[PDB]
Design an enzyme around this catalytic site. Structure first.
Site, PDB file in Angstrom:
ATOM      1  N   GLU A 164       0.832  -1.215  -0.144  1.00 20.08           N
ATOM      2  CA  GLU A 164      -0.006  -0.015  -0.013  1.00 20.08           C
ATOM      3  C   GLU A 164       1.006   1.324  -0.075  1.00 20.08           C
ATOM      4  O   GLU A 164       0.975   1.882   1.104  1.00 20.08           O
ATOM      5  CB  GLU A 164      -1.071   0.148   1.177  1.00 20.08           C
ATOM      6  CG  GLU A 164      -1.702  -1.339   1.194  1.00 20.08           C
ATOM      7  CD  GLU A 164      -3.088  -1.378   1.709  1.00 20.08           C
ATOM      8  OE1 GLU A 164      -4.014  -0.608   1.003  1.00 20.08           O
ATOM      9  OE2 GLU A 164      -3.374  -1.785   2.946  1.00 20.08           O
ATOM     10  N   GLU A 365      -4.702  -9.240   2.001  1.00 18.20           N
ATOM     11  CA  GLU A 365      -4.907  -8.667   3.490  1.00 18.20           C
ATOM     12  C   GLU A 365      -6.400  -8.901   3.565  1.00 18.20           C
ATOM     13  O   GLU A 365      -7.165  -8.150   2.807  1.00 18.20           O
ATOM     14  CB  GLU A 365      -4.083  -7.502   3.882  1.00 18.20           C
ATOM     15  CG  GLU A 365      -2.829  -7.587   4.250  1.00 18.20           C
ATOM     16  CD  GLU A 365      -2.492  -6.310   4.484  1.00 18.20           C
ATOM     17  OE1 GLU A 365      -3.056  -5.384   5.192  1.00 18.20           O
ATOM     18  OE2 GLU A 365      -1.352  -6.023   4.242  1.00 18.20           O
TER      19      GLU A 365
END
Length: 461
Positions: A164, A365
């Site tokens: 990210e 995730e």
């Protein structure tokens, strides 16, 4: 409810959050920040010991495979493996550590999956060069990656450049939750760019290497959670298109389509905040596209047209173009004030199918974070975290529907196997399938561990 042959099962984590600071040469931003302001971290617990995976990685991985896992994603910290940043010289102790990690994965039946960068730039590069704002820093990052490919390529064939990067961009330059925690739109857009660049160049280096250290997949870990408009009005529609361009499209398109989105570029330029680019830089981005992707998902995002349009703004922000929106009646995890909406996983899945050439991907995730977990231990001392079984169940279900709809998805990783150190929040909210007691560092699988064993072991819901 049957998942593909070869489905990844397991969880996610990172170095910074699991290892501890044992034997580690440098400080990353978070290491640094804790030393400066320990009072910013829940209960005063920084990353010095975290979940002690410096010591326990072997026993851990033997616990996880016993728990039905076939893959495992952690990260290699630049601040441990690299001695001189400028030459990217190998720290021998760091090397023998990450070999323990990889070697343990294989010994155990477990696919080693490795991210290179997880919110953990070395403090030194920030202090010296302005960190990710620096295109020398980027080269140095390239340098670092090659070492990992050279040193672990023969056994790690699954690689991710960032976790990210947008979160690094927001944390550091927009919302004050990564150090230096400044608020500066221009640097932010330039950091946005540089990570996208660093991704490309890292992929280059990977593919430039010897055929036997470049016969795996390489990608990056992004986000594609949709930004849902508050209503169908053209204006709410418009805020949600922007919220998607920035939060989602910027990186998704750099990684998959080798270009930043024309629309966003046009806006940034109009707003006098476009990044300093280079035509040769733009070609490398175009020439270096991900073999594949992990996407992270914990919660939807909802937005509306701004309540207020400002004449003056001190710093640039993408929130110029949208506001948060709370949907009456939404389902919520109180602990975090975060909406629960498992349907978005399907939306994400269809969005890959229809806008990102259905290229391969996994949910890198997924997980739910609760506090006071103490309270759900039955007679036996095992936390009966039904809420996590259900949360996971509901997400996995939509993931299933996405696959059935054609979505080229090849794995689900739970954030996270063992309760780990959640940055400023530290150990406030637990996310593990396996409890870690932070005093004694003894682990104790929760109900979800055993439920997730069934799921992975039978390849079914």
């Amino acid at each position: 409810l049957a998942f593909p042959k070869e489905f990844w099962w397991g969880g996610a984590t990172s170095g910074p959050q699991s290892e501890g600071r044992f034997a580690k040469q440098h400080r990353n931003l978070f290491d640094y920040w804790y030393e400066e302001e320990p009072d910013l971290f829940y209960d005063y617990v920084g990353p010095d010991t975290a979940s002690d995976a410096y010591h326990q990685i072997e026993s851990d991985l033997t616990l996880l495979a016993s728990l039905g896992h076939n893959s495992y994603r952690t990260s290699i910290q630049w601040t441990r493996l690299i001695d001189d940043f400028e030459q990217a010289t190998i720290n021998p102790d760091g090397l023998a550590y990450y070999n323990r990690v990889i070697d343990a994965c294989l010994a155990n039946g477990i696919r080693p999956v490795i991210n290179l960068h997880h919110f953990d730039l070395p403090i030194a590069l920030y202090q010296a060069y302005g960190g990710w704002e620096s295109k020398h820093v980027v080269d140095l990052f390239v340098a670092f990656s090659k070492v990992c490919f050279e040193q672990f390529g023969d056994r790690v064939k699954d690689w991710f450049v960032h976790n990210e990067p947008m979160v690094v961009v927001e944390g550091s330059y927009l919302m004050q939750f990564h150090y230096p925690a400044i608020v500066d739109g221009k640097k932010a857009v330039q950091v946005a760019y540089n990570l996208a660049l660093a991704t490309a160049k890292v992929i280059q280096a990977y593919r430039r290497g010897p055929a036997e250290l470049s016969d795996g997949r390489i990608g990056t870990i992004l986000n594609l959670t949709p930004a849902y408009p508050a209503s169908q009005s053209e204006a709410d529609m418009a805020a949600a298109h922007f919220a998607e361009l920035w939060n989602n499209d910027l990186f998704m398109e750099a990684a998959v389509h080798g270009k930043f989105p024309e629309e966003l570029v046009a806006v940034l330029k109009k707003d006098g905040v476009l990044w300093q680019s280079t035509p040769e830089e733009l070609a490398l981005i175009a020439e270096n596209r991900v073999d594949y992707l992990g996407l992270n998902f914990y919660h939807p995002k909802r937005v509306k047209a701004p309540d207020a349009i400002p004449v003056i703004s001190p710093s640039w922000s993408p929130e110029w173009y949208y506001d948060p929106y709370l949907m009456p009646g939404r389902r919520m995890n109180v602990d975090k004030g975060w909406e629960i909406y498992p349907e978005a996983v399907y939306d994400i899945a269809i969005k890959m199918r229809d806008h990102y050439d259905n290229i391969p991907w996994f949910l890198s995730e997924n997980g739910v974070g609760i506090s006071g977990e103490d309270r759900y231990r039955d007679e036996t001392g095992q936390i009966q975290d039904d809420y996590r079984i259900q949360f996971l169940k509901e997400h996995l279900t939509y993931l299933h529907k996405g696959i059935e709809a054609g979505s080229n998805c090849f794995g689900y990783h739970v954030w996270t196997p063992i309760d780990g150190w959640s940055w400023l929040n530290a150990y406030k909210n637990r996310y593990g399938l396996v409890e870690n007691n932070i005093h004694t560092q003894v682990r104790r699988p929760k109900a979800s561990a055993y439920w997730f064993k069934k799921v992975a072991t039978h390849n079914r819901l």
